[PDB]
């Protein structure tokens, strides 16, 4: 493979300082402007609003507008201005670097797959959580659809199997993917009604489409809160943190545009303006950047490296989500 960080050094090791345990929630289809913290007039993140140490970032722009385009760029060394979607999977990415330096990498997926990101690493480090084969939380809704919270089940066994190592766990959400937003959340999150149901989105009033979308965000609030709560159970033995970033936003009819995937040359703001959250325990010494920092997906790679005390020449000048 073609390297970007052959020089990378982990300055400190888990045998000499506390091991570090991080969950990176790779979000899906979530819009910054539907987040309460960014000024949305509905409380779409009530559980995160009750957790001390959550930072919300109000100015984050995605690389692109589809999962296929954005996800590889989120883990790239190139940044958005330089990213090449066709050669991305055959170049060293940030997970390759962290794995080489001894961080135990796990990717659980309730979306599709890692879009090439995990391809160079052992197959055992990727797990499909879209089916009842691996996901124990699919029977809670009329659609028999497997839920993102299912990805948390059994993570204590992974920690036990990597006892005392640094660990980075990616949880790739179904999140707010459409067009059937109403299917994305269990009935306990049907806060905003009426909702757009059925297979004909044009038959639905705009407000009912928004309602379904916002209900799906409530389920994501819950998932991120449960991810933090899970991390908190390991805080004595590990330095624990959680990063959340959505891969792109979503058009909900603005200017006659729906869904996502619009080429960047024409993409409206709602497809690229994404939420991002960072949480850490007080013991870690990790400090968030200012909430209004002008940020992009280019911040992800340097954040992940910084979380594990890794430096790489190519990202020296790059702003992260953390100091
Ligand atoms: Zn990018
Ligand atoms: Zn999509
Ligand atoms: Zn996506």
Residue numbers in the entry: 219 to 541
Show sentences the authors wrote.
Based on sequence alignment, MCR-1 should be a phosphoethanolamine transferase, a member of YhjW/YjdB/YijP superfamily which catalyzes the addition of phosphoethanolamine to lipid A moiety of lipopolysaccharides (LPS) and therefore confers colistin resitance to its host.
The Cys414-Cys422 bridge stabilized a loop (aa: Lys409-Glu423) located at the top of the protein whereas Cys281-Cys291 completes the catalytic site by locking a smaller α-helix (aa: Thr285-Met292) to the central β sheet. In our study among the three identified zinc ions in MCR-1C, two of them were located at the active site and the third one located near residue Cys291. The phosphorylated Thr285 is considered a catalysis intermediate during phosphate transfer thus stating MCR-1C the first native structure without any bound substrate or reaction intermediate.
